[PDB]
Design a protein around this ligand. Structure first.
Ligand SMILES: [Cl-]
Lengths: 132, 6
């Protein structure tokens, strides 16, 4: 009878093992034991992104944001979802919001968020070039 | 760094 924290830790181990459907299911079990922890949802959202299940990832980002409106990763993963959906202006807005929140929270992700912003703006520009 | 689980 594992605790919610034990199930999150098992999911994280499976994530290290690149067993993403199994990790996502573990995070679901953690949610069953405590559905009020935003990190369980952003962890699962990242699994769904790795699994190319952007619709399921977006839903988890929304669940996380309801619980933690300041979540950097919820905004970042949401922007990644929107990039795949070709909602470029929304994706850029969420990536800039993740950048702002990470700065406010003194979080260090190297150059990950600016790199994602550059990817998003290039894809937006590429979408313009593909139509003329 | 950001594409990691917490
Ligand atoms: Cl269970």
């Amino acid at each position: 009878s594992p605790s919610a924290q034990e199930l999150k830790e098992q999911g994280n181990r499976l994530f290290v093992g690149r067993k993403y459907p199994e990790a996502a299911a573990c995070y679901g079990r953690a949610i069953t034991r405590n559905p009020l922890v935003a990190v369980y949802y952003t962890n699962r959202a990242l699994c769904y992104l790795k699994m190319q299940q952007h619709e399921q990832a977006l839903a988890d980002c929304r669940r996380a944001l309801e619980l933690d409106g300041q979540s950097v990763k919820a905004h970042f993963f949401l922007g990644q979802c929107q990039l795949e959906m070709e909602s470029y202006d929304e994706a850029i807005a969420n990536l800039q919001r993740a950048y702002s929140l990470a700065k406010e929270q003194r979080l260090n992700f190297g150059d990950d968020i600016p790199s994602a912003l550059r990817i998003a703006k290039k894809k937006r520009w590429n979408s313009i070039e593909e139509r003329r | 760094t950001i594409e990691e689980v917490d």
